[PDB]
């Protein structure tokens, strides 16, 4: 198992524009294209990304290379953030996996409610942060992934994911 593996679980890969959870419009391998209620606005996004005519489609190969450039995106955004890279930078390398795959989820800026985790965290306070990360509205929308991403912070293995 690797971030890649774990996300690739949690988004799952559709090949056609599709709406999120949020309902807003993505494609591949949870690639958001755009926070407007318009399809041609997702549309136009999508073929700026590709950099072809898409069409609302793309192949295998274009998602996996979308999702490459995310996972990347994400580690960096972590890094270049004040308040994440200590975080993460005290941590072990199942649990920054476990980091990734909520920034890549939420953003930067979703990740902001969860000060206090972080802190905990950063204290190695496992199962304090567990427990306050539940009490989210991330947690409430999103419960099944939550919980995993929550177990994988907690016990610091692969668990959930088997
Ligand atoms: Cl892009
Ligand atoms: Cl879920």
Do not use: C
Request: aromatic share 8%; net charge positive.
């Amino acid at each position: 198992m690797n971030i890649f593996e774990m996300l690739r679980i949690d988004e799952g890969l559709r090949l056609k524009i599709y709406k999120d959870t949020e309902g807003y419009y993505t494609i591949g391998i949870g690639h958001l294209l755009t926070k407007s209620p318009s399809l041609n606005a997702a549309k136009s996004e999508l073929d700026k990304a590709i950099g072809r005519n898409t069409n609302g489609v793309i192949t295998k190969d274009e998602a996996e290379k979308l999702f490459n450039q995310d996972v990347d995106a994400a580690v960096r955004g972590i890094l270049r953030n004040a308040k994440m890279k200590p975080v993460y930078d005290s941590m072990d390398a199942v649990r920054r996996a476990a980091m990734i795959n909520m920034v890549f989820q939420m953003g930067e800026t979703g990740m902001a409610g969860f000060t206090n985790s972080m802190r905990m965290m950063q204290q190695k306070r496992w199962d304090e942060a567990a427990v306050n990360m539940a009490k989210s509205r991330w947690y409430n929308q999103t419960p099944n992934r939550a919980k995993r991403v929550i177990t994988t912070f907690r016990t610091g293995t692969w668990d959930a994911y088997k």
